[PDB]
Design a protein around this ligand. Structure first.
Ligand code: NAG
Ligand code: NAG
Length: 254
């Protein structure tokens, strides 16, 4: 009656295509699967429908190929996340602080070749993160203007110039910015401009805090009403970026 069904193997497959039923004496030849290689090259792998209607005994014949081992790129590292360079395993590339990755971070062990295995991508490099000097602004000299390039985390501080005339400047934005990316700084070069707010006045209400001669940017003035009045607006104002009291001035209604 024969042997109708053949057992599937880990590392092998029938070389050609199978028919529904086999009769005794016939043989199925096996071959390494993709990504495998012979355990003992040359050794012919085949099942034989024996005369007892069973399939003969065939040991496992191939073994997972492996992509070449990989070295850590300079200033970085390669991670065998799967614990080997086996076929069907992936590696991750990462760079040390101060360094960015140039290339493809994840590489795959693939049977790109009809015969043989190779990584899907070449290894990246790790390039040091050097960003160019920040732009000077109006009356704004950054530190190390004389310097030509800043490495990672080098920090520049922005200096407002001396007064053009009577009233001095007030540096809007953040004075200190740092080199955090290969071509990136952390903050925009901050505007340095004379910011002064109008003296805060309130009918029936005294100025509790402040009294600064000139209320420059970020000055802060607390205000409260005179005896008998109930506050209606917000007690604390802040000299604004646009020289406007932020928020609006309070009122002191009966
Ligand atoms: C190998 O590791 C990666 C990352 O954890 C995971 O995505 C993948 O499934 C793993 N593959 C194997 C064969 O373990
Ligand atoms: C690898 O880099 C790509 C961009 O090249 C990014 O989209 C991806 O999230 C990164 N993955 C890892 C594990 O670093």
């Amino acid at each position: 009656t024969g042997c109708d069904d053949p057992p599937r193997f880990v590392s092998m497959k029938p070389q050609g295509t199978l028919k529904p039923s086999y009769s005794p004496g016939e043989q199925i030849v096996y071959e390494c699967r993709l990504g495998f290689q012979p355990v003992t090259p040359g050794q012919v792998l085949a099942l034989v429908c024996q005369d007892n209607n069973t399939w003969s005994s065939l040991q496992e014949g191939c073994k997972k190929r492996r992509c070449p081992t990989l070295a850590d790129p300079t200033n970085g590292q390669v991670i065998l996340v799967n614990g080997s360079t086996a076929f069907g395993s992936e590696v991750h590339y990462v760079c040390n602080n101060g360094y960015y990755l140039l290339g493809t971070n994840i590489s795959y062990c693939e049977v790109s070749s009809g015969t043989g295995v190779n990584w899907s991508d070449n290894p990246p490099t790790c390039e040091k993160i050097l960003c160019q000097p920040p732009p000077e602004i109006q009356n704004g000299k950054y530190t190390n203007n004389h310097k030509d390039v800043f490495e990672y985390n080098e920090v520049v501080t922005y200096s407002c110039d001396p007064s053009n005339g009577p009233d001095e400047y007030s540096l809007v934005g953040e004075s200190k910015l740092t080199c955090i990316g290969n071509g990136e700084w952390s903050s925009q070069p901050p505007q340095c401009k004379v910011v002064k707010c109008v003296y805060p006045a309130i009918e029936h209400g005294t100025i509790v805090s402040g009294f600064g001669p000139k209320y420059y940017y970020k000055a802060t003035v607390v205000l409260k009403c005179n005896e008998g009045f109930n506050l209606y607006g917000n007690s604390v104002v802040v000299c604004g970026e646009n020289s406007t009291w932020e928020p609006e001035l309070p009122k002191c209604i009966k």
